[PDB]
Every structure is written in C-alpha cells, then in structure tokens.
C-alpha cells in the first residue's frame, strides 16, 4: 500500500552473472543494514562460471557493489587409497544466500564431487556445498553434508539406498533464530529429496582447511523411503521455519516437494526430528505446488500461518481450458492441535504464463495497521509480461483477496523481475519495513522503500434541526436578522514517524447536493457555500476542532423545505513543490458527510422526539453444529412518536454470522443495507427512513448465514436496535435474541446382494456376496460407531451357506463369532434367515466418522451343494440383518438424538434344469 514506486534504488552486477538470483538483508554488528546479493554465473579466476556473492551497502542512489572473496579453486587431497576431488566449475555459488546474526551463508548447489580409488570411483556428482563468511572478522567456513567416500559398486549392491550423491544441498536454505542452518537438497536419496541441518557455530569450529571430507558431529539429516509417493518429489526444493506445534522450545520445519506423488505436489510441516506433523496436498498435477513457502502470522493472532505457491497452476477460460496463471494458497493456523484444513484463501494470477506464486515474501507490517503483510511475485506477469509484484495486506480474517499495491517491472523483457524477494526489514531506518526485488535476467536488484502512513480522522457536528422562525444573528456590517447555527469540524492525523511539520487542507461544503446557485445555507462571514482550511497537525497528538457559523437564507428566497441539507468535509494533503517527490501517504477517513434539516412536524415545541419500538424473532432456530445454517431474522420496527431522522436498524452479528440479504413490507421492497465491520463486532445497518414518520411501521426480514463456528457454545446471541440522529430519545430499546445451538447427525445404512437372484445347475457352489454400506450425511461428526451383522449359519457342513471372507473398508475393523471359513481356502419360498438356524454375528467398530465420509463391509460366501440338494425342489431366500448405532458426537452441547438404524439384504435361489 505504501511502497514508493517512483524513488527506486537500483543495484547492478556484471553482465551475464545473474546478479539478483537470490538476496537477503544483512545486519552488521554495528547495526547498519546491507544487502547480500547472489550472482550464480559470475566468472571465476580460470575464466569460467563459478558464481559469486556481493555485499551491497545501503545507498539511496544504488550502484555497483563489492564482492565477498571465496575460494573458487578446485581441491585435491589424497587420503590413503582414496583421492578426494571438488569441482567448482558451474557450481552456481550464490544460487541461494541467507544472513543470520553477523554471518552470511552462500551455497553452490551444483558443485560436483568425486572420489577415486584405483579402478573404481564414487561418480562425479552434484553433491552441493555452502560457503560461510563473517565479513568483519574475515572468517570463512564450508559446509557440504552430502559428501561421501563410498564407491559406485556399493550403491548398486544396495539398490541405491541412502544415496546422497545428487543432493544439490543449498538449493534452498534458511537459518533459525537459534542459529541452525537448514539446507534443502531436493536431489538427495536419488532425487527423493532431503534436509540437512547443523548449527552455524559448529560448522565454523568443525571446519578444517585441506580436509574435504569431514562430519559436523551435531548435524542431522532427514531419512530415505521406499514409498513410491516420494520418488522424484524433490523434497526440499524450498524450505522455511516457524511455530506450528505449540511448544516454543522446539522449532518446526516447512518443506516443499513440488513433484511429490506423481507431480501432484506437496508441502509438509515437520518437527526438529523430521517427523511429519501435517502434509498439504497439491490441487492439480504439474502445478508445482510447493515451489514457494512462506511463514508469517497474517491475521494477527500470534499463530504463524502458511502460504504455498503453485506457479504453474492452470484455471479454466472460455477460449482456454488450460490457462496457466499461477496460484497462492493461504492456511491459517487454528487453536490447539487441530490440523490445518482447507485453504482459508486462494489468490490466483490473471496473466497467462505469469508464474504468480514463484516467490512469496513476508513483509512484516508494511503499513503498521497491526497485521502482517505479504508480497507475491509474478516474474512474467502484467499485460506486457515483463513481471509484477503484488502486495497483500493482513486483516482480521487473514488476507485481503484484492491487492493494495502492484509493482510493475522497471526492467526489459526476460529480467525475471520478482524471482527472488525479501522484506520485513527497515533499510533506511524510517520505522517501516522495505522490499527488495531480484531480477537476475537484468543482472540487477530493485529496492522499494515504505513511506510513512498518515491515518486521517474526520468528524462533522451540526444541529439535528434548523428553525427559520428563530433569528439570533445578523449579517455582518448590515443588520439583517438571520437564522444562524454553528458547525464544528474536527480533523485528526495519526501514524508512526510522520513528519513533525505536517499540514492538511480541509474543505467544507454547505448544502452540497443542491446546485451552485441553489444553496439554501451559507457561511455568515463570507456568505459563500464553502471554504477550505489549512490545519496544522504537525506533532498534534490530538485532533483539531474548529467551529464556524452558517445561516439559512431568507424564507422566500428558496422553495425546498423538505429536502435535507447535506454538509461535507473533505481532507487532503497539500501539493508538492517544484520538483515533486511526495513524502507520506494519506489514508483512513478523509471524507465524511452529515446533514441537518428545517423543522417539520415536531409539535408546538418544534423538537422532534421519537418513540421507536422494536420486536423480533428468529425462524429456523435450532442451529446445527458443523452445518451451513441460514437463519431468517424477522423484526417489526415502528415509531409511535415524532419523526426520527436518518433512522436505521442496527443488527449486531455474532462471530459465525454473515449478512446475506434483507427485505421489507412497504409497497420500497429491498432495503439499503450496509455491513459495517468498523464496530468491534460485525454490524449490519439498514435504512428505515429519513425521517421515519410518526406511526410508521416497517416489518423487516433478513437472511443471515451462520457459518461454521465450532467454538460458539450452547447458543449464539444476536442484538438488534433502531438508531436515529435526534437529540431527544434517539434509539429504541435493545432487543436480544438467543438462538440455541445443537449438533445433529444422520447415518444411513444400505445393503444389497451380489448377485441378486441366483439359479443353480444340476466342487464349490455358486458365490454370493452381501454388502452393507454406512454414510454419515448429517452435519455433525460421529464417534464410536458400532455395526453388528447377523449372517445365517456358522459355516458348518450342515449349514446352507459357507462364509469365506469379510472385507471391511474405511477404517472399520470387524470380528466374526463364530469364525468364518474354518477350512483353509482363498477369498412356497423357504425363508432361510438368522432367526431359523444358528448365526454368525459379525461385530465392527469405527472410532470416528466425518461429514460425507463412508465405510462398507462386504461378506463373501457360497452355497454348500450337499445342503442345498437336501430339499432338491425348494425355493430358498437367504436373509441377513444389520444393526448400527453411535456412541457420541464430539461437541459442546448437542442434545438431540444419537444416530441408529437397521438394514436387511435378501438373496433368492431358483431351480434350473
């Protein structure tokens, strides 16, 4: 919202160096902020690409930066029979950079490495490597945890198990506040992907020049897997850190695997010991869900929220089924140990092939409104395709769906403007965090600075009614009696680090709605319809109030006496001087209108005193927990007193409720309603009349969707009141409605046999299956669901049916009694039912069943021919029966009825020749 788009600062690096492929803010011991910039194709000493790292100091003008010196030589060390080799050609140094404390960490993902031993070798592979530097001391160190000394033969014999040869460690990187460097290595374990963690202090102390292969005792890596889902998933393509388990002592990792599960994509949240806490699945194949990850509390409740990028996400369009645009996903972290559910918000790019979501940067609180903000990058976005960076501000419910500010690429085509981003850091010490944007294609870095945000407040106070017959003033100089009245206007201005020399212009307009030469009121001094004031708010913590005096024109000079007289107050910043360059940004309430009117029908005292009455009730009252409720508030508003000016109904909604629509019985059919979230709670205000005349009575019907509120309690409260602008008796009494909340569930049990009918011919008899299914359709979740199936016979040689196998599904576990299939093996109408012969009662259990969730059990069996041909001319009907019930529902107060029911499956047998 408040980044300066005009006064930008450009840092540039060597041509073809890809300067700005990665970047980060760096703070020295003395406190000064600088910018670390990575250039992964900078030429090295031997005239070949090895990458490089620059350290730009903060200058408003920008320019060329100095580079940090790093060993770009190849090493060769002979240790016994083995020969260690490092290859820094095209290593891509600076492909990722990250600062912590007074340390900078720059990595070369594609630094190759090989071990030779006589005939054999360990293969020349991109193990990756990171260079650590402490500028002020000049100390250096290296970290490369995927270097091994196992020969190529041993991996083949062990099916390439625990194969770190292709790690490319440093692909992504992040450092914890405790000082723990976490490297992402998507090529690890044969392109499964792995993470390597170690404390920075230990990397420096453990480092020894001339020793290529060593271990940093205190390091820890992720594990390998035999699960096909993870193969070629590039786990660790991106990395981040945060708090997601509740315990502040531990720290949680956030990892991106953008091709996980056959290019479906996935992001996982893990603990310090690399155990999965959550896994967020990609929405669409080949969308690269997990290309970017960011962690910040956007909704301002303390708990970190997760953002995920899928730059290749495709949406549908009239002339394009596969319209690639990119998409960002927002997951708010809830209270307790609840799992991160579906996305709380979806942001989707508009430009084709823009790659919206390839970078996501937490900005901190960019405008200092209380909520943290993010920046999302579209390296090829905008109508030109040159690239864009869109800012999204934090709010009470997460993020705004619309961007507050869009930054177009100042570089030519192909720059990749916004491929790398960093915010959350004040570079010029003005109190507002700033943004740096990489453009490696243009070999440059752009810097945007946050301007101070001035929050304007405006207010306008006037009498509720004007009496022409009362003339207490006289026009200056002359002595012409006039009906005069005061007008007060108050303007304030708040914000952090706003200039001590600040001023605003305040324009006041009387009777704004009337034409220029039809204004019914004027200012007593100038006799004009308006004036502008220059208010000096410089350093004034309080708002400034000034009162003026207006007057109503002669009675015969104007005809309209009914229409209300509108007063407006418009506040703006003065213009900038010759040369331009605006300092601050002005937002908040800069415009406001109030009104007054000529006295009318207020009785002999000429003072309108209303008697506002309100009664209400709710239809469809029992609110179902975990449902999509839609209440209808029915309320009758009436005034048995005198006119109420700017009359309006004010309905205060609870946390779960949302205004849908409103109606009335006048014959005006639909009401002019406006939902105001400005009040501490969500409020809906509908206009009842201006004025609401005497003996006027409006019935109002308002639809309201009470959304999912799992922590609402036994009931939710609605509050309703009619408000007016009058001086005497302005408001009606406060009507409160307590709508009760109770959970309900509806489980359905279905059954059928396969086949239905079964004819028989003259070792095994014909097979028959009886399949039951359960389906929780109702709103509430159900726990402790017990199912009991009754099957005829106990699979005995004397029985008609032989039960082979029972196949339950959906987390359902069953136990038959007596056992089924006592042998080995794979996997008139005679009513043969469990009521007649002995019975095999199968009992099942399900611990929990969500909404829309299902579970089925299939019982397999076949006829026992010897038993069947006892009675060789009978018509049999095989019957089974199933009962079910539920223990409880996991909710606060759900006094309704626990689900129960029964089902029955028949199978008929027929005689054939």
């Amino acid at each position: 919202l408040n980044l300066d788009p005009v006064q930008l600062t450009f840092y540039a690096g060597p041509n073809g160096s890809q300067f700005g492929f990665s970047l980060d803010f760096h703070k020295d011991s003395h406190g000064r902020v600088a910018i670390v910039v990575g250039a992964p194709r900078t030429l090295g000493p031997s005239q070949e690409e090895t990458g490089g790292v620059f350290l730009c100091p903060w200058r408003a003008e920008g320019g060329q930066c100095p580079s940090l010196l790093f060993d770009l030589r190849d090493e060769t060390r002979n240790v016994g029979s083995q020969t260690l080799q490092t290859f820094k050609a095209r290593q891509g140094l600076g492909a990722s950079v990250v600062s912590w404390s007074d340390v900078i960490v720059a990595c070369a993902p594609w630094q190759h490495w090989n071990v030779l031993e006589k005939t054999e070798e360990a293969e020349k592979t991109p193990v990756g490597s990171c260079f650590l530097a402490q500028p002020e001391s000049g100390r250096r160190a290296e970290y490369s945890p995927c270097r091994g000394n196992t020969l190529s033969r041993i991996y083949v014999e062990n099916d390439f198990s625990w194969d770190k040869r292709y790690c490319e460690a440093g692909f992504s990187s992040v450092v914890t506040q405790a000082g723990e460097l976490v490297l992402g290595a998507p090529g690890g374990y044969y392109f499964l992907g792995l993470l390597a963690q170690a404390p920075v202090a230990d990397i420096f102390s453990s480092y020894r020049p001339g020793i290529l292969l060593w271990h940093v005792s205190s390091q820890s890596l992720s594990f390998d897997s035999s699960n096909p889902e993870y193969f070629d998933g590039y786990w660790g393509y991106s990395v981040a850190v945060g708090e997601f388990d509740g315990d502040l002592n531990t720290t949680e990792y956030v990892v991106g695997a953008p091709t996980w599960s056959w290019t479906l994509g996935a992001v996982e949240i893990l603990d310090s010991y690399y155990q999965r806490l959550h896994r967020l699945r990609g929405e669409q194949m080949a969308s690269y869900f997990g290309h970017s990850v960011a962690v910040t509390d956007v909704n301002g409740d303390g708990r970190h929220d997760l953002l995920v990028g899928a730059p290749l996400y495709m949406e549908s369009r009239a002339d394009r089924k596969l319209a690639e645009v990119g998409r960002v996903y927002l997951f708010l972290q809830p209270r307790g140990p609840h799992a991160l559910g579906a996305p709380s918000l979806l942001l989707t790019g508009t430009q084709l092939y823009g790659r919206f979501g390839s970078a996501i940067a937490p900005l901190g609180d960019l405008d200092r409104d209380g909520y943290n903000d993010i920046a999302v990058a579209a390296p090829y976005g905008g109508p030109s395709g040159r690239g864009q960076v869109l800012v999204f501000l934090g709010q009470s419910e997460g993020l705004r769906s619309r961007p507050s500010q869009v930054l177009d690429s100042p570089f030519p085509t192909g720059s990749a403007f916004g491929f790398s981003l960093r915010g959350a850091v004040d570079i010029d010490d003005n109190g507002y965090p700033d943004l740096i944007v990489g453009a490696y294609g243009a070999n440059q870095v752009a810097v945007y600075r946050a301007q101070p945000v001035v929050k304007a407040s405006v207010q306008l106070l006037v009498q509720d009614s004007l009496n022409p017959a009362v003339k207490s003033c006289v026009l200056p100089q002359t002595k012409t009696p006039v009906s005069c009245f005061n007008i007060q206007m108050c303007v304030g201005a708040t914000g952090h680090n706003i200039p001590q020399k600040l001023s605003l212009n305040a324009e006041l307009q009387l009777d704004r709605q009337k034409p220029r030469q039809g204004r019914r009121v004027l200012l007593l001094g100038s006799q004009q319809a308006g004036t502008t004031l220059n208010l000096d708010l410089g350093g004034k913590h309080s708002p400034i109030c000034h009162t003026t005096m207006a007057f109503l024109r002669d009675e015969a000079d104007f005809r309209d006496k009914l229409s209300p007289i509108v007063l407006s107050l418009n506040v703006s910043l003065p213009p900038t001087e010759a040369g331009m360059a605006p300092a601050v940004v002005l937002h908040g309430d800069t415009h406001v209108q109030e009104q007054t009117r000529i006295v009318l029908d207020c009785g002999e005292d000429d003072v309108c005193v209303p008697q506002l009455q309100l009664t209400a009730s709710v239809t469809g009252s029992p609110l179902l927990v975990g449902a999509d409720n839609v209440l209808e508030l029915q309320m009758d508003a009436a005034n048995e007193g005198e006119g109420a000016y700017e009359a309006e109904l004010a309905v205060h909604l609870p946390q779960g409720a949302h205004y849908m629509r409103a109606l009335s019985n006048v014959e005006f059919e639909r009401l002019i309603c406006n939902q105001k979230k400005e009040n501490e709670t969500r409020v809906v205000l509908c206009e009842l009349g201006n004025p609401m005349k005497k003996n006027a009575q409006i019935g109002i019907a308002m639809l309201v969707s009470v959304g999912n509120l799992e922590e609402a309690g036994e009931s939710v409260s609605f509050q309703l009141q009619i408000r007016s602008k009058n001086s005497q008796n302005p408001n009606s009494k406060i009507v409160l409605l307590d709508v009760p909340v109770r959970a309900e569930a509806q489980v359905e049990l279905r059954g059928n046999s396969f086949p239905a009918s079964l004819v028989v011919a003259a070792s095994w008899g014909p097979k028959v299956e009886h399949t039951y299914e359960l389906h929780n359709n109702g709103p509430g979740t159900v726990n402790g669901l017990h199912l009991s199936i009754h099957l005829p016979g106990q699979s005995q040689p004397s029985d008609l049916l032989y039960i082979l196998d029972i196949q339950p599904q959906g987390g359902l576990q069953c136990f038959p009694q007596p056992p089924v299939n006592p042998l080995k093996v794979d996997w008139d109408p005679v009513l043969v039912s469990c009521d007649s012969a002995p019975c095999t009662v199968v009992q099942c259990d399900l611990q929990e069943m969500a909404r829309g969730q299902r579970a089925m059990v299939t019982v397999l069996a076949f006829l026992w021919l010897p038993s069947l041909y006892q009675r060789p001319l009978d018509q049999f009907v095989l019957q089974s029966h199933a009962w079910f019930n539920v223990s409880s529902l996991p909710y606060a107060v759900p006094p309704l009825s626990l689900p129960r029911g029964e089902a029955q499956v028949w199978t008929q047998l027929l005689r054939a020749c």
Binding site: E123, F191, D232
Partner: protein, 680 residues
C-alpha cells in the same frame, strides 16, 4: 402499458436502446407531447409513430459461407457453416448452429516419438518391422498415409547424464559389457514419408542410450515435434497422430533448475540441419499449459502409449490435455501396432469444440446434439461416434453492454482439425438519426442543446423539453406520500437529477435504479459474471442464478460412461447432485450398494426385444439401454472379464449373458441365442 423502456431512459435514442433489447425509439416530431418516446415497437405504432422514424434494430446472424460437408476425404469440408457475420445490439444475445462431421478415409500422419533409454532396448527389437505392418492395417482406414520417427532420452547434462569416467561420456554403458549411444535430448530421424519401408530401414539403425533419473525429457520431444512444422512435415489437410511411447515418468517445467537451467521454454523450434534439439541443455522443459497450446494450434492428437506402471499418471495428463488418448503398452512394445489402430478409432470417437480468440466482452453458451436427436444442454462435445457420423451444436453469443471497438472476431473450432467456423461480430448501438444531429440548435433555446432524433439534449445547467429553465413544480415521485427522487436526486424543473456517487451511476425517473448495489459472491459483484442493472444481476450467456455463479456448462458433469452424472444424478452448476440412492462421487460413478447391472438392468431383452415392462409410454426405453447386443454362443470365459449372470425368462427358461468392464469400461452385451427351458 408501462414497462422497463418507458420508466427509465427517456432522454436520448442511444440510452433507450441501452435499456433493453426490446426497447424501440420514435424520432417522429409529430408524436403527441407526453406519450413515451422510448417503448415497445407495438406501443409506438399504436400511437401512430412514423414507421421509418422508428429506431428498432434486431440482432442477427447472417451466414456468409455455407459449403456442405464432404462424403469422402479424396477440397474436403468438415465444418459447416465456415463463416458467419454476427450482429448484436446492447446486452443482447443471438444463437446459431454449427455442424461438425468427420469425413471418412481422411489422410493420416503418424510420428513415432520413442523413449530410447536403456529399458527400451528390447522395444527396438519388437518394432523392427513396424511401419509396413502398420501400413497394411492402416490402408483399411485410409487411402493416403505418411509415417515418421523420432527419438528422445533426456537433457544431456549432469545429473541427468553420467559424466564420469571420461569414457562414460563416449559410452554411457561403460560399466556394462555392451556399448550404447551418447546421450541425446531429442533427435528427429525420419520426416513423414510415403515410403513405409524406409521407417523399418531407419528403426534398425537406431540404438538406445542410458541416463540416471527415472523421469525423462519426453515433453521436450513432444514440444519440438509439434512446433517444428516444416522439419516433421505435417500435412495441412490430414489427421495428425503423435505416438508417444515411454515406460517412465516425464519431466515438467521447473525441473530443469536441478540441472542449473532456469530459462523458461519459449515454444520455438530449435532443431537445425543436424536434427537435434539444440536448446536441450540451455532451456527448461515445457510446462503442461504451453505444450497444450501448441498441440491445439498445430492440430495434433497426442497418444500416450505407456506401460501399466505409469498409466494412471499419463491418463491424468490426458484429462487436462484435449484431443489425447492413452494406450496400455506392453513392456516390450509388442502390441503397439494394435494400440495405434485402437487409439485412432478412439480419438475419432469424440468431437470436442474449442473457442479461439474470444473477446472479453462476449460470452458463449453451448447445447450439443449427438446421435439421434438427444439434445444435451451445456455441452460442447459428443462421444461414442464412428468415422462418418455427423453432429450439430447450438451456440449462443451474448455481449455485455456495448464495446468501443466496432468490429471483433473469434473462431469456434473442433479439436485436432484444421476446419473451423469464424464468427465476425458487429455491434449496432448507435441510432441512424444521430448522423443527422444538430448541435447548438435553434430548437433548443437558442443553442443550449443538441437536437437529435426529435429531442433536445440540453447542455450544462438547462433542463426541459426545449431546454427552457436553468434553475429558478411537478410529480418527482410515484405517490404524494412517498418522498422526492428517492432521496437520491433533486427535483429541478419537475425532473429528478440524480446525485453523483463514488461507486457508480444513479439513474431512473426517480433515481431508484442503481448501478452498484447488486449482490456479491466472493468480493465480486454478480460473481464477475454479469452486469448490475437497477439492483438486479443480468447474467452472461453461460451463467445463471440470482448471483450469476451457477454455470450453464455440463462438461464436468458427464463421465466416461456416456450420460450426464453417470447413471442418475441432476447436474447443477457443473456439479452433480446424485439421486440414485447410495451413489456418490464427482459424477455419481461410485455406488457399492447399487443393484448390479446384471439384475435390474437386464431390460435390453425386454424393452426393445420382446417389448414389455416400463419405458413404454415414456421416452427412456433405449436411452440407458444402448449396448452392443452381440449374439455370441457360449464363449470360453464364464465370468472373468465382466459380470455374467442368468435369469428365468417368460416361458421358464434360462437366458445367459454378460457385460460390465474390460478396460475402463466396455458396454458390450454377450447374450446367447437359444434358450434352455424345462417341462415341469
């Protein structure tokens, strides 16, 4: 009587037309002073308005080109009509039909993109004589045919390729006894040629190579195969089959970062005289969307011929990519010959329409008519067809408001075919009497307004029928008790002049109509699928409902089955609402407790054959029942590749049959000929 025309825009001729498509305007100066100038044509005429003075344009769709479709592909036309001059008025729609039809014996091209990594060594041996054997079978389906060959492995760079020892770069099979080719991204081999025998000659000259990771650079190949028109040699008037054989995953865009490649794919051809993809090592793999675009433009039908291990992967790609088909290749590619033949018939089973270069202002709605006259609304595709069959689609084109740009055009086109229907749109919003306007007219108070179409358009300050009063007593409200101009305007000169607003415009005789008070869905007025008019959303051609967020489309509602929502289920807003008790899924495809087809749905020897039962007086006898009634007599497969059963017929005899599924779904009955009865 009173209507939207009269009680709204009674200012100008242009506003009148903008109010509604049914509004006409009368420019006759003789019209009685008072009667509504903007009304229905019938009402203007009933006030004896001069017919030639009546402005009432009607939207139309004049056919420009209408060549009948061809019977034999031996120039061929498969889309009629070819061009249509559409012409619309403000916020108005117009419908028109198009007839797609696949000509019989149309020429075919076949390029063979082959994975040649180490695992496909045995596949080369079984492909040795493909081409001539492929010809022999293809000669039945077409008279003209050309075939070509391609080959690919992956990007020749670490870590995709092995780079040590130095000999490994010369021979990736160094540690193994045999010796294989150096690694290549993609190489063109045989340009589409009529000599089928040369394909066989070239395939024997080919050999495999080796690489590290399981995923491959097939999508790089497919891209180059598509975009390099002149090198591959696709015919303009011919079917384009691209056969893509592979036994493993495929690399997508953004994978190249692991090989230090970030430069995005440009969709350009980079295969020079040496017939190698030169940009393999410098450019990233193509994305799914970018590849799909080129496949569409070049009318290529991509065939995913892949092994079982990786079938579901590529089947899920075919869902996103239109005009494609999957075929289960064996591990030695020994069944590829039949796979292509089956794929061709399958690709030509479907006729799907694609829109191209549609302007933002236009929106389109489709109703499909396939076999029989079963019209299926909200559909632009027909399936279960055979080569030669003909179908038609009813297309409606609505415009939103009135665009500045006077002429626009777009193209409705069948997927994978050159033929298309170009629609030229023209917007008629201006009245004819505007051209004969008269500004600063003597008729409007000595030049205080322009006189066009029998009305004074007054300049700033003045109002009235001739612009009389400036500022200085009539009904500015419906009733006496009701307030003035809905407190949204000023009753100046007996005429409401509405206030301005930050959100939009306030119009109407009493400022009652708004242009920004409509209902929102997700921070979007009319869900961004309709224009707001006096509080009510006027939805576009392909959206319905009070919010304009319920689509008219039923594309996502249909399943591989054939009917919408598999069996039963009402399609609503692109999502099925399953009616069949116990059924669930996206298209109600899943139903464990449904009475098996081999039980209740045995009416195919009841409704049609020996007519009896339900569906006699209702139009749904052979709607569900439309399977292949093959009269085979006791084949050696009694319950294995389907769900067979038997029941007792009318005369107490057994009737044996079978149908269910072989691969994905095959609705083919196998009922016996003669029944077997009993005496008692």
């Amino acid at each position: 009587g009173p209507n939207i025309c009269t009680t709204r825009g009674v200012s100008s001729c242009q506003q009148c037309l903008a109010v509604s498509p049914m509004c006409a305007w009368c420019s006759d100066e003789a019209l009685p002073l008072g009667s509504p100038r903007c009304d229905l044509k019938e009402n203007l005429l009933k006030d004896n308005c001069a017919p030639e003075s009546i402005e009432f344009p009607v939207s139309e769709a004049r056919v420009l080109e209408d060549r009948p479709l061809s019977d034999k592909g031996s120039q061929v036309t498969q889309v009629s009509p070819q061009r249509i001059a559409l012409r619309l008025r403000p916020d108005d729609s117009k419908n028109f039909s198009i007839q797609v039809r696949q000509v019989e014996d149309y020429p075919v091209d076949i390029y063979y993109l082959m994975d040649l990594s180490y695992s496909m060594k045995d596949d080369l041996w079984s492909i040795q004589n493909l081409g001539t054997k492929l010809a022999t079978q293809m000669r039945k389906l077409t008279s003209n045919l050309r075939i070509g060959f391609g080959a690919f492995v992956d990007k020749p760079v670490s870590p995709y390729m092995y780079i040590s020892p130095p000999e490994a770069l010369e021979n990736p099979c160094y540690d193994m006894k045999t010796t294989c080719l150096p690694m290549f991204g993609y190489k063109h081999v045989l340009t589409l040629t009529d000599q089928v025998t040369r394909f066989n000659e070239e395939v024997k000259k080919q050999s495999v190579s080796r690489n590290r990771d399981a995923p491959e650079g097939g999508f790089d190949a497919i891209m180059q195969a598509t975009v390099c028109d002149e090198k591959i040699g696709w015919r303009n008037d011919a079917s384009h089959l691209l056969v893509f054989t592979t036994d493993a995953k495929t690399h997508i865009a953004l994978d190249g970062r692991l090989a230090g490649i970030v430069q995005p794919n440009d969709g350009q051809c980079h295969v020079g005289s040496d017939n190698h993809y030169s940009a393999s090592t410098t450019m990233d793999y193509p994305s799914l969307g970018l590849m799909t675009e080129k496949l569409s433009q070049k009318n290529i039908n991509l065939i995913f011929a892949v092994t079982e291990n990786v079938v579901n992967l590529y089947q899920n790609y075919s869902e996103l990519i239109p005009g494609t088909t999957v075929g289960v290749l064996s591990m030695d590619s020994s069944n590829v010959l039949q796979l292509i033949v089956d794929a061709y018939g399958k690709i030509r089973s479907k006729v799907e329409l694609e829109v191209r270069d549609l302007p933002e202002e236009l929106s389109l709605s489709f109703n499909a008519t396939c076999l029989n006259n079963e019209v299926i609304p909200g559909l632009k595709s027909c399936m279960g067809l055979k080569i030669g069959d003909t179908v038609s689609f009813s297309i409606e084109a609505k415009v939103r408001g009135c665009p500045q740009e006077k002429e626009k055009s777009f193209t409705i086109k069948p997927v994978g075919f050159k033929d298309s229907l170009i629609v030229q749109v023209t917007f008629d919003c201006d009245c004819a009497c505007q051209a004969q306007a008269e500004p600063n007219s003597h008729r409007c108070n000595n030049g205080n307004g322009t006189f066009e179409c029998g009305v004074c358009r007054c300049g700033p300050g003045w109002l009235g029928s001739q612009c009389e009063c400036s500022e200085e007593q009539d009904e500015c409200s419906p009733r006496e008790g009701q307030p003035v101009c809905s407190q949204r305007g000023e009753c100046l000169c007996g005429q409401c002049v509405c206030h301005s607003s930050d959100f939009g415009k306030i119009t109407g005789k009493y400022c009652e109509c708004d242009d920004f008070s409509c209902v929102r869905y997700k921070g979007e007025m009319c869900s961004g699928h309709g224009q707001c008019s006096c509080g009510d959303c006027l939805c576009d051609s392909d959206w319905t409902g009070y919010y304009c967020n319920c689509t008219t489309r039923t594309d996502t509602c249909m399943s591989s089955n054939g009917l919408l929502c598999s069996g039963r289920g009402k399609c609503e807003c692109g999502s099925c609402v399953c009616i069949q008790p116990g059924s669930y899924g996206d298209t109600c495809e899943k139903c464990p407790t449904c009475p098996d087809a081999c039980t209740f749905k045995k009416e195919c020897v009841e409704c049609k054959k020996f007519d009896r039962g339900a569906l006699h007086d209702e139009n749904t006898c052979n709607r569900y029942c439309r399977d292949e009634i093959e009269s085979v007599k006791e084949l050696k497969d009694t319950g294995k590749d389907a769900v067979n059963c038997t029941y007792k017929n009318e005369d107490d005899c057994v009737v044996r049959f079978q149908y269910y599924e072989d691969s994905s779904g095959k609705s083919i009955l196998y009922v016996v000929e003669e029944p077997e009865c009993c005496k008692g």
